[PDB]
Amino acid sequence: ESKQKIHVGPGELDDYYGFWSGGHQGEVRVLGVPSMRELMRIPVFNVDSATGWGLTNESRHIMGDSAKFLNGDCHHPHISMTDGKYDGKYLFINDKANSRVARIRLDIMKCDKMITVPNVQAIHGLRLQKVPHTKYVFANAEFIIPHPNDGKVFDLQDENSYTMYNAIDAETMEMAFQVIVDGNLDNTDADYTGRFAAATCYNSEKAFDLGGMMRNERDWVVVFDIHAVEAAVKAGDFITLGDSKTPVLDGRKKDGKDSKFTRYVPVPKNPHGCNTSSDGKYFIAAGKLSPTCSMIAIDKLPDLFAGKLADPRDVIVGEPELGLGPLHTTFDGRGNAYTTLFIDSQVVKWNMEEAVRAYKGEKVNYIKQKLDVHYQPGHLHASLCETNEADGKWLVALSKFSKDRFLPVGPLHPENDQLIDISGDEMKLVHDGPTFAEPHDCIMARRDQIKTKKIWDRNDPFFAPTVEMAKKDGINLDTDNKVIRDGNKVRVYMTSMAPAFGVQEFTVKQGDEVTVTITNIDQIEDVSHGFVVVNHGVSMEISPQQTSSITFVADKPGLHWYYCSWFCHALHMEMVGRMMVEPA
Amino acid sequence: QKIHVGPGELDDYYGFWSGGHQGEVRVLGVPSMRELMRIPVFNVDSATGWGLTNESRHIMGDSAKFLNGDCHHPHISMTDGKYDGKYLFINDKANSRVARIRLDIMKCDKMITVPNVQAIHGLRLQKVPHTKYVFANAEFIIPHPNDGKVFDLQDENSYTMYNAIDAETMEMAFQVIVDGNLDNTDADYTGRFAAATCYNSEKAFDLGGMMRNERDWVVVFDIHAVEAAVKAGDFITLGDSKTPVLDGRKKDGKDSKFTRYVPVPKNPHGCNTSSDGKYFIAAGKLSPTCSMIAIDKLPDLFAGKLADPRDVIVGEPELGLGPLHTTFDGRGNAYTTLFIDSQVVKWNMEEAVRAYKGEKVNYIKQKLDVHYQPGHLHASLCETNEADGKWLVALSKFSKDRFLPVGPLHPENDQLIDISGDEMKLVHDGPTFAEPHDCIMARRDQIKTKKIWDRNDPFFAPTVEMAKKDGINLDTDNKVIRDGNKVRVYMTSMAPAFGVQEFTVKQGDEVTVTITNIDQIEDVSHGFVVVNHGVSMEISPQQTSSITFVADKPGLHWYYCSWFCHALHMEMVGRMMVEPA
Numbered sequence A: 001e002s003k004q005k006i007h008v009g010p011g012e013l014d015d016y017y018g019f020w021s022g023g024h025q026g027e028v029r030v031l032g033v034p035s036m037r038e039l040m041r042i043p044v045f046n047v048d049s050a051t052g053w054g055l056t057n058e059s060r061h062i063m064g065d066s067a068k069f070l071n072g073d074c075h076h077p078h079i080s081m082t083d084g085k086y087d088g089k090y091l092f093i094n095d096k097a098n099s100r101v102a103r104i105r106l107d108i109m110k111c112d113k114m115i116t117v118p119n120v121q122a123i124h125g126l127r128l129q130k131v132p133h134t135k136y137v138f139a140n141a142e143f144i145i146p147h148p149n150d151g152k153v154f155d156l157q158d159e160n161s162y163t164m165y166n167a168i169d170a171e172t173m174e175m176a177f178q179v180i181v182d183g184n185l186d187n188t189d190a191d192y193t194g195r196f197a198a199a200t201c202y203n204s205e206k207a208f209d210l211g212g213m214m215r216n217e218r219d220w221v222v223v224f225d226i227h228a229v230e231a232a233v234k235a236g237d238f239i240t241l242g243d244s245k246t247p248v249l250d251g252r253k254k255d256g257k258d259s260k261f262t263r264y265v266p267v268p269k270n271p272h273g274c275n276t277s278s279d280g281k282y283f284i285a286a287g288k289l290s291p292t293c294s295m296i297a298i299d300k301l302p303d304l305f306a307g308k309l310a311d312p313r314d315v316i317v318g319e320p321e322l323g324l325g326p327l328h329t330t331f332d333g334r335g336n337a338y339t340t341l342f343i344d345s346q347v348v349k350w351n352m353e354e355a356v357r358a359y360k361g362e363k364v365n366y367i368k369q370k371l372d373v374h375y376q377p378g379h380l381h382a383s384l385c386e387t388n389e390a391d392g393k394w395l396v397a398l399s400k401f402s403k404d405r406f407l408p409v410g411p412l413h414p415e416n417d418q419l420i421d422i423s424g425d426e427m428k429l430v431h432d433g434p435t436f437a438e439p440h441d442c443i444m445a446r447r448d449q450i451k452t453k454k455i456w457d458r459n460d461p462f463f464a465p466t467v468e469m470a471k472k473d474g475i476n477l478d479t480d481n482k483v484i485r486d487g488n489k490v491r492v493y494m495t496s497m498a499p500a501f502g503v504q505e506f507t508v509k510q511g512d513e514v515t516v517t518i519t520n521i522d523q524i525e526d527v528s529h530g531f532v533v534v535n536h537g538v539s540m541e542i543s544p545q546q547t548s549s550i551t552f553v554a555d556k557p558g559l560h561w562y563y564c565s566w567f568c569h570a571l572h573m574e575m576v577g578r579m580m581v582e583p584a
Numbered sequence B: 001q002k003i004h005v006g007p008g009e010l011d012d013y014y015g016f017w018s019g020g021h022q023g024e025v026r027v028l029g030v031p032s033m034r035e036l037m038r039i040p041v042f043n044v045d046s047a048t049g050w051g052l053t054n055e056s057r058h059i060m061g062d063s064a065k066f067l068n069g070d071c072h073h074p075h076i077s078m079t080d081g082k083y084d085g086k087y088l089f090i091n092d093k094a095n096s097r098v099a100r101i102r103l104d105i106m107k108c109d110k111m112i113t114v115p116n117v118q119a120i121h122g123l124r125l126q127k128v129p130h131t132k133y134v135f136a137n138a139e140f141i142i143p144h145p146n147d148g149k150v151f152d153l154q155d156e157n158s159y160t161m162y163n164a165i166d167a168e169t170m171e172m173a174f175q176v177i178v179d180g181n182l183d184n185t186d187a188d189y190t191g192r193f194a195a196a197t198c199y200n201s202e203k204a205f206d207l208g209g210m211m212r213n214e215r216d217w218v219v220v221f222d223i224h225a226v227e228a229a230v231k232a233g234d235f236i237t238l239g240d241s242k243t244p245v246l247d248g249r250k251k252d253g254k255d256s257k258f259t260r261y262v263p264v265p266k267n268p269h270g271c272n273t274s275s276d277g278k279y280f281i282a283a284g285k286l287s288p289t290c291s292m293i294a295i296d297k298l299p300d301l302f303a304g305k306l307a308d309p310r311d312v313i314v315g316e317p318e319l320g321l322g323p324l325h326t327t328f329d330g331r332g333n334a335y336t337t338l339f340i341d342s343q344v345v346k347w348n349m350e351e352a353v354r355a356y357k358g359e360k361v362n363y364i365k366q367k368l369d370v371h372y373q374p375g376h377l378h379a380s381l382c383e384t385n386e387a388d389g390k391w392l393v394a395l396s397k398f399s400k401d402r403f404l405p406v407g408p409l410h411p412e413n414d415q416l417i418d419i420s421g422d423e424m425k426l427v428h429d430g431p432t433f434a435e436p437h438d439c440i441m442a443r444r445d446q447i448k449t450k451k452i453w454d455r456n457d458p459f460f461a462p463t464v465e466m467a468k469k470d471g472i473n474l475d476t477d478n479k480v481i482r483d484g485n486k487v488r489v490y491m492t493s494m495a496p497a498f499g500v501q502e503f504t505v506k507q508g509d510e511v512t513v514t515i516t517n518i519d520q521i522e523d524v525s526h527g528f529v530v531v532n533h534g535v536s537m538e539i540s541p542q543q544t545s546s547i548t549f550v551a552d553k554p555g556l557h558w559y560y561c562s563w564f565c566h567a568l569h570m571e572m573v574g575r576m577m578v579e580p581a
């Protein structure tokens, strides 16, 4: 029976962490499951007024040149793995809007690295190497562009117009390699060995019109032999593009002939999801325009890459007919797959091995249950489904139209992320969770897979550059309350300890570029401070033992108040200071 | 009183949460406490484009340059002391603004930078006869003018001001110069009186200096009298602002016509009007009391019929350590947060008034432990004469161990408490991001929202004017207008296709894309993102939205629909082609 409790009462804790994509809003959200309450927001591609992410020097340093963008579009959150199990170190996420990948450190729940993927447009599909560990982050660039894209050629049928599959080194967050592909790229997953990855393609037609993109009854799943790519990179057998030293391998077909890096497995039709079963047997492609999933036997891939198979379709071992609009698939670890039907507006539960038998002509009932969802589901996620610990307890289906499921709030509606108990034979819908801005996908982890810090380490790399700047000024950040003058630059350093800033007044000249660096020397957990300069667009958080810094121009003469924004003490309202700006 | 709202069931109340330092307003359902929507106000929102779009930046004015805000105090407009559901107003402490949200479309539609002040904190609405004015406190004393010649806060021209904004026009009505400073504010149930707490009666600018006096005050304003001075032209103006400024300071011990200063201990904070209209209740903060000002006595105070401003105080109950804010069940009880004791204290107001006269009565009914360090609290419909005594939310600043660890930054804990009976019962812990300070609840039937946009909506009227000047009919046209180094692309959109799927411009052109969503089905939103240009916006059904960006990169640049709108959403794309210089 499906019977688990969803209520988490006052004083009780959730059993799992949920990491939600922020969708078009650009952040990552931490939820407790099964309460479905949002515990934290982690700013990534958004600018966050509260913490100052996007304003502070530390955050802008992480974002690099891309700190000029105030937007992102996130879809695909994934947690780093060791030996096919979550290791709790990192969360990675895409940015479709400005072509980035970000890394979040799960001990501090902050974005700590970010990369603009070179020579591509729109980072969509993203998933992680599972075994031996997450060495690579694999990311799809969705859109075909010219190379170079310098405005001389615009034609997407040109021989140098393409997109690429991308591998980022997880630990360094520098590029590892790129593989040029035929067609385009939608979603991606990885096997349980480290050798193989796979991605769906919906535009095998290389067409730039809606209808053109649906002409072929089959596109493909493209499979990558990562070992062969790695070998070619070691041999120096690669080109580079634009200004990037990233190794670029060519995985396109040449006059019908396969490269060593890729195989193209025909699959109907504009397929979307690409999901690796938790037993490691299958890459399962969701058929979208075709009312099917296609099951690729991972076991057969070495033979495919060796030329031992007559036809690339020989790796397909199942093509179950499921219903209208299949988009994404997940796993209970009991041998069932669960697939979203966008058009039928359901989740379909189906037995994978039976579908494989059906494909060989046995008459079997692989469909177990169809559950109505509300409405038009996209992704779905079962607890621990990306790991060999898939536990079959909870499932979340993320549906794009909520219609009448919540109180009306105007023309813009929330998404409906529905919690489903899958612990028994029958799926049961237990909670409707409204969410903002279209999280597309989410990922769950056991409470015991995530270990967080209670207060910051003074040596944390997040603010290491600030610590270096201080050293150059002769400043001991744990103690000093000083104003350094450097031409028209002023560098204010202070400690803070509730309810007092360590520097409560300073004076500068109109036009000076002021940097304020604050170290919160409280040691009690949860005593955060803030810093806001009135009417100057200046806001940041400083948590216990953190150093944070922010730069602004003092372009207004007169007296300008600053205050602590984070309620920190009974005397919080009085935790203030004054900047005096002498007229030009 | 059940809190579970199962699948297919709806919440009973709307809750409008302040976003705190994050800058937005959040719409919640109560009692599920689930967040239904976020309304961008002072933040920049990637999803909808608020802060990026032309419509949003027009509303924000010059303050569109700021990417931050600090909001505390959401309030819903009233008619005859009851919510009318038309508007929600909120402060911005960081960049000195007031914003108005239109509740039919759940969008910010007006915003004002309050002139000649620093830090808009306390905010509340006129109740009766209706919300003509929004009252807003500027917290921090500054020089006038603030030109860098005088920094002394003891100067006669160093002060702050109480502010009244016309609710319907969102222009300034008037400002009142006060002694001291201003923290929170409320209004009576007649329209004549408003009141604000002050914590710096000392006009001191060190921590100790600000706590020198046992008593600061509540400043009470005679709004009728202020309006009169403004009508007669008996006002000054400051700097470049035409706003009428009245002087409410004492002069050589003599009262102004506009104000009375009622001494209250100590660095008082909350300032709340009881739902029966009888009292302004000031929370004592550093004093373990609230002070109860009898609104009935204020006309006598302003007429000079009372000997001593303290004669309007009719209760000063001792409640516990760190009282910050008070709310009402409509049954004669007040509920006050004790920040230091970490409790909500339920107390009987009439009994406290009897205790002040020396009767031995225990006006304290219950103290409920909350988790931990509560700031504001809010009982359902407490700001109206319909206060219903059902639900109470206490908004606590430290959550400690009440939720899964998430790192050094913790959520706030907004706790739902059933107050329908004699005994307060804690029912739900709601984690929230970024310190919502206060919140406001409304019955489902007090809010009426639009399902799709009106083509005449003022929100995008300026864009409609731009289109008109170009000869464009937004409901139909798909055209590129060329105008020097400006390019104005106009298109309709209807799932799964943009009306214009390719256009060509020159490197350096300032490109405006205006999109009108001509779907009529509810909930079919589209988006528009230009890859690698930092361009993102929402276009909901029948909305027109527009965005301007520089085509600074030669070559082919994709654009796409960000809002999953149709089975063929991934395919709702286009291409901008940029010719090199």
Ligand code: CUA
Pocket: A498, A499, A500, A528, A529, A530, A564, A565, A566, A567, A568, A569, A572, A573, A575
């Ligand atoms: Cu520091 Cu509030």
Ligand code: CUA
Pocket: B495, B496, B497, B525, B526, B527, B561, B562, B563, B564, B565, B566, B569, B570, B572
């Ligand atoms: Cu339009 Cu998705």
Ligand SMILES: [Ca+2]
Pocket: A202, A203, A204, A205, A212, A213, A214, A215, A216, A218, A219, A269, A270
């Ligand atoms: Ca296709």
Ligand SMILES: [Ca+2]
Pocket: B199, B200, B201, B202, B210, B211, B212, B213, B215, B216, B266, B267
């Ligand atoms: Ca004082």
Ligand SMILES: [Cl-]
Pocket: A187, A188, A272, A273, A274, A275, A328
């Ligand atoms: Cl997928």
Ligand SMILES: [Cl-]
Pocket: B184, B185, B269, B270, B271, B272, B325
């Ligand atoms: Cl208040």
Ligand SMILES: [K+]
Pocket: A400, A401, A402, A413, A414, A415, A438, B564
């Ligand atoms: K939606």
Ligand SMILES: [K+]
Pocket: A567, B397, B398, B399, B410, B411, B412, B435
């Ligand atoms: K807090």
Ligand code: NA
Pocket: A062, A063, A064, A113, A114, A115, A173
């Ligand atoms: Na980087």
Ligand code: NA
Pocket: B059, B061, B110, B111, B112, B113, B170
């Ligand atoms: Na305005």
